[PDB]
Amino acid sequence: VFKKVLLTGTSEESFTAAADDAIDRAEDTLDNVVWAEVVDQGVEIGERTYQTEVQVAFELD
Amino acid sequence: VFKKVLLTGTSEESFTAAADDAIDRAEDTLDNVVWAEVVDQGVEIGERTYQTEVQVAFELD
Amino acid sequence: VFKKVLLTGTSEESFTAAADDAIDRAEDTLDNVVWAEVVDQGVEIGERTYQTEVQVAFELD
Amino acid sequence: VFKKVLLTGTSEESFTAAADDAIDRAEDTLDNVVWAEVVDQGVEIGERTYQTEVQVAFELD
Amino acid sequence: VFKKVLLTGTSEESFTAAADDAIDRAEDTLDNVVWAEVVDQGVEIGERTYQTEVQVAFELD
Amino acid sequence: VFKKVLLTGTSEESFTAAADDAIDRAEDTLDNVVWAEVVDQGVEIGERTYQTEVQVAFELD
Amino acid sequence: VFKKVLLTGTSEESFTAAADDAIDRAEDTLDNVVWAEVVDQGVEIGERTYQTEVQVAFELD
Amino acid sequence: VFKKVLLTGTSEESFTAAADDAIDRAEDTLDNVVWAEVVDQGVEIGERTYQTEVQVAFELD
Amino acid sequence: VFKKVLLTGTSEESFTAAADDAIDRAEDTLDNVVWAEVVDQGVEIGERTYQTEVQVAFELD
Amino acid sequence: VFKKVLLTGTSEESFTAAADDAIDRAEDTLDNVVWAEVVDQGVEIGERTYQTEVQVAFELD
Amino acid sequence: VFKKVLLTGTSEESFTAAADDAIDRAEDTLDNVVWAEVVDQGVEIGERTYQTEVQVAFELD
Amino acid sequence: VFKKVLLTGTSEESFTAAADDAIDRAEDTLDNVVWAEVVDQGVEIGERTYQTEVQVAFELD
Numbered sequence: 158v159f160k161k162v163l164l165t166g167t168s169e170e171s172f173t174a175a176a177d178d179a180i181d182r183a184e185d186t187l188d189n190v191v192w193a194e195v196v197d198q199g200v201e202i203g204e205r206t207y208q209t210e211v212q213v214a215f216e217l218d
Numbered sequence: 219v220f221k222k223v224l225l226t227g228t229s230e231e232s233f234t235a236a237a238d239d240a241i242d243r244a245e246d247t248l249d250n251v252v253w254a255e256v257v258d259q260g261v262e263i264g265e266r267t268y269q270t271e272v273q274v275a276f277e278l279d
Numbered sequence: 280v281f282k283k284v285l286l287t288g289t290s291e292e293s294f295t296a297a298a299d300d301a302i303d304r305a306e307d308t309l310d311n312v313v314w315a316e317v318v319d320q321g322v323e324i325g326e327r328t329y330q331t332e333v334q335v336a337f338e339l340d
Numbered sequence: 341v342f343k344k345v346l347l348t349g350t351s352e353e354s355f356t357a358a359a360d361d362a363i364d365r366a367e368d369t370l371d372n373v374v375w376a377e378v379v380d381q382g383v384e385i386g387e388r389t390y391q392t393e394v395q396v397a398f399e400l401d
Numbered sequence: 402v403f404k405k406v407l408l409t410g411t412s413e414e415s416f417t418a419a420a421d422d423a424i425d426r427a428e429d430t431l432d433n434v435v436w437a438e439v440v441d442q443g444v445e446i447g448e449r450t451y452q453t454e455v456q457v458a459f460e461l462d
Numbered sequence: 463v464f465k466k467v468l469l470t471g472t473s474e475e476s477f478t479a480a481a482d483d484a485i486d487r488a489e490d491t492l493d494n495v496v497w498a499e500v501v502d503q504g505v506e507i508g509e510r511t512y513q514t515e516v517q518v519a520f521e522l523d
Numbered sequence: 524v525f526k527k528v529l530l531t532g533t534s535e536e537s538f539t540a541a542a543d544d545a546i547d548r549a550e551d552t553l554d555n556v557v558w559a560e561v562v563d564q565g566v567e568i569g570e571r572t573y574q575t576e577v578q579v580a581f582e583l584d
Numbered sequence: 585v586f587k588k589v590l591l592t593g594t595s596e597e598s599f600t601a602a603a604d605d606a607i608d609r610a611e612d613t614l615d616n617v618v619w620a621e622v623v624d625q626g627v628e629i630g631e632r633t634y635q636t637e638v639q640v641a642f643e644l645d
Numbered sequence: 646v647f648k649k650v651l652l653t654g655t656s657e658e659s660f661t662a663a664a665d666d667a668i669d670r671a672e673d674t675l676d677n678v679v680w681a682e683v684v685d686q687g688v689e690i691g692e693r694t695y696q697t698e699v700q701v702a703f704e705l706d
Numbered sequence: 707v708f709k710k711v712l713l714t715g716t717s718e719e720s721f722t723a724a725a726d727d728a729i730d731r732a733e734d735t736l737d738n739v740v741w742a743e744v745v746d747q748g749v750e751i752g753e754r755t756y757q758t759e760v761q762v763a764f765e766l767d
Numbered sequence: 768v769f770k771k772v773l774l775t776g777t778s779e780e781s782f783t784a785a786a787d788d789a790i791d792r793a794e795d796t797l798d799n800v801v802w803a804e805v806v807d808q809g810v811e812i813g814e815r816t817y818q819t820e821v822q823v824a825f826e827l828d
Numbered sequence: 829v830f831k832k833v834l835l836t837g838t839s840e841e842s843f844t845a846a847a848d849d850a851i852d853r854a855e856d857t858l859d860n861v862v863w864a865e866v867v868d869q870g871v872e873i874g875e876r877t878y879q880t881e882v883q884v885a886f887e888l889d
């Protein structure tokens with residue numbers, strides 16, 4: 158069984174980093190993270206901060 | 219990092235309330251709720267109860 | 280078996296009412312209406328009239 | 341020919357109001373506004389402020 | 402209030418089983434599971450293992 | 463001309479059956495059913511009953 | 524209240540005709556047809572026959 | 585940089601014309617129109633007038 | 646088994662022709678072409694050339 | 707690099723089989739098939755034959 | 768009220784830059800740019816130039 | 829006529845590279861590659877490898 162969590166990473170360098178950012182939180186706090194699928198991307202402006210929302214996937218048990 | 223939870227609120231008054239309803243649960247039980255995005259809305263009939271499913275967003279740490 | 284009909288309700292008060300409006304037609308004319316799912320919403324302007332298109336669901340037999 | 345503008349209204353009462361809000365800006369500043377179609381809805385929390393993003397439509401010439 | 406979790410079941414018999422598989426995990430670990438909605442389906446090949454990703458829904462409190 | 467009806471079949475065995483179920487109602491009550499397209503699938507839990515919503519297509523005249 | 528029916532027109536000349544084709548059936552058999560929205564288009568080959576599936580809309584009462 | 589405008593053309597001959605119609609307005613009033621992408625199509629009935637909504641694209645500066 | 650290829654036809658007359666255009670290439674080079682489904686349509690401007698992208702379907706063996 | 711092919715399998719038993727059916731063609735004729743993702747499902751009626759369209763994925767080189 | 772404009776940035780380095788590119792045009796010419804949401808990304812080839820289409824958002828008044 | 833192929837590139841540096849990766853395979857093996865459109869992006873974890881699935885487009889003849 159996999160499970161997914163919907164996290165948004167933010168970096169002031171790139172979207173790819175913005176992804177890494179969240180994947181790193183999922184990993185700080187869950188074991189067996191298997192993949193992640195990008196569901197959205199945006200830029201905070203209002204430094205400019207890029208965001209990448211990921212469904213992080215992770216094997217149950 | 220943000221995180222999201224997929225909750226469905228229900229009110230017998232309106233969709234807006236049906237949203238409030240869930241946002242209030244997310245808040246009962248999580249700190250730093252930042253926003254929420256409506257992903258669906260329906261009406262239970264089978265009183266008539268309106269539903270609004272929200273992705274509730276909330277800042278990690 | 281359920282069946283669905285694609286109806287658009289209109290109210291000059293709100294979207295929630297605009298939904299009620301149609302759900303009330305489905306009920307005038309069908310027995311066992313079980314639920315309804317919002318598929319769209321708009322505003323006539325050209326009073327301002329709000330619309331909510333619903334797939335109204337109803338149990339066959 | 342119609343044209344559309346992508347505006348987000350916000351009210352601290354409801355989504356329907358959040359729609360009205362923007363439709364009122366489109367009207368402050370354009371003639372012949374014909375309709376509007378809801379493309380999204382959210383709630384600012386981080387008072388609670390409801391949003392409704394509309395494609396506002398308006399007849400050219 | 403309902404809540405949902407995004408789980409992927411896998412069976413080497415069918416998609417329907419692949420669904421059951423996850424619904425059984427949601428139930429091992431949560432009370433009041435009300436329904437589930439299929440959001441995706443795939444086949445691992447690289448025995449052939451069918452997958453069905455479900456949003457499992459479950460009543461809060 | 464084809465026409466379509468939006469029906470949901472339910473079986474306690476599988477999604478495929480859940481489809482058959484509705485296609486059988488469309489056929490009980492319409493002549494020339496040509497095809498059907500799956501638009502959704504879910505599981506009632508709250509026995510476990512699988513659902514498959516179909517747009518059933520059928521030739522007019 | 525509007526209602527919609529999901530019809531597919533076919534012409535061996537064009538998609539636009541393929542639309543007209545169905546809108547003409549909706550009109551043969553319903554009063555107050557208000558508009559129609561194209562939901563799909565295809566070509567039968569297996570003369571070449573173009574199809575346009577429409578949600579035909581029509582005012583109730 | 586490109587920019588886009590969301591225009592709806594209408595012709596009483598065809599969808600293709602309904603597209604041309606708007607692309608001609610974009611051109612009346614903007615320089616460097618590069619392409620356009622069809623986002624929707626409908627028929628006014630309530631002569632029969634075909635519509636094609638386009639995102640018209642045009643190079644900035 | 647069917648298979649599909651993702652081709653874009655272009656004509657300076659219409660979208661329907663733009664479809665024919667590609668369906669004719671699929672046929673130049675494959676046997677048993679069964680149908681085709683329109684996935685997109687656009688206009689080159691930057692004569693005006695209409696495009697229709699098709700998934701062309703064709704029976705394997 | 708992966709590559710994908712868009713195939714439709716058909717079985718007169720189930721959707722899962724209808725998937726297997728195509729995955730078996732992809733394998734008859736390509737090496738390293740890694741996975742497959744269901745993009746659609748339908749039933750031929752006009753025996754009843756279930757279909758499952760798959761994007762079959764397969765590692766290049 | 769927010770408003771949005773649909774711009775496509777292009778860079779020969781990355782998608783993130785391709786985003787920055789447009790966000791910089793929106794800013795050259797509008798005050799209060801609040802955020803931006805990625806709606807598409809592509810690569811011109813026919814140097815290789817990456818594109819990122821953004822809905823740039825900006826507070827009215 | 830254009831044609832498209834559905835390829836997934838992977839890089840351990842970024843999504844943009846993950847795109848380049850596949851566009852480079854399409855070019856190794858086809859003449860006249862005109863553009864490419866991003867349809868998905870993910871990260872293998874289970875080094876971290878970023879993926880970008882592209883529809884690579886290429887002019888026939």
Ligand SMILES: [Cl-]
Nearest residue numbers: 163224407456
């Ligand atoms: Cl989710």
Ligand SMILES: [Cl-]
Nearest residue numbers: 285468529578
């Ligand atoms: Cl429908």
Ligand SMILES: [Cl-]
Nearest residue numbers: 346590773822
């Ligand atoms: Cl837009």
Ligand SMILES: [Cl-]
Nearest residue numbers: 651700712834
């Ligand atoms: Cl494809």
Ligand SMILES: [Mg+2]
Nearest residue numbers: 169170171204
């Ligand atoms: Mg920096």
Ligand SMILES: [Mg+2]
Nearest residue numbers: 196197198210
């Ligand atoms: Mg997002």
Ligand SMILES: [Mg+2]
Nearest residue numbers: 230231232265
């Ligand atoms: Mg009340």
Ligand SMILES: [Mg+2]
Nearest residue numbers: 257258259271
């Ligand atoms: Mg819902």
Ligand SMILES: [Mg+2]
Nearest residue numbers: 291292293326
């Ligand atoms: Mg009033």
Ligand SMILES: [Mg+2]
Nearest residue numbers: 318319320332
């Ligand atoms: Mg509507």
Ligand SMILES: [Mg+2]
Nearest residue numbers: 352353354387
């Ligand atoms: Mg108040």
Ligand SMILES: [Mg+2]
Nearest residue numbers: 379380381393
């Ligand atoms: Mg929005």
Ligand SMILES: [Mg+2]
Nearest residue numbers: 413414415448
């Ligand atoms: Mg077995």
Ligand SMILES: [Mg+2]
Nearest residue numbers: 440441442454
């Ligand atoms: Mg999945």
Ligand SMILES: [Mg+2]
Nearest residue numbers: 474475476509
């Ligand atoms: Mg049983």
Ligand SMILES: [Mg+2]
Nearest residue numbers: 501502503515
């Ligand atoms: Mg359903």
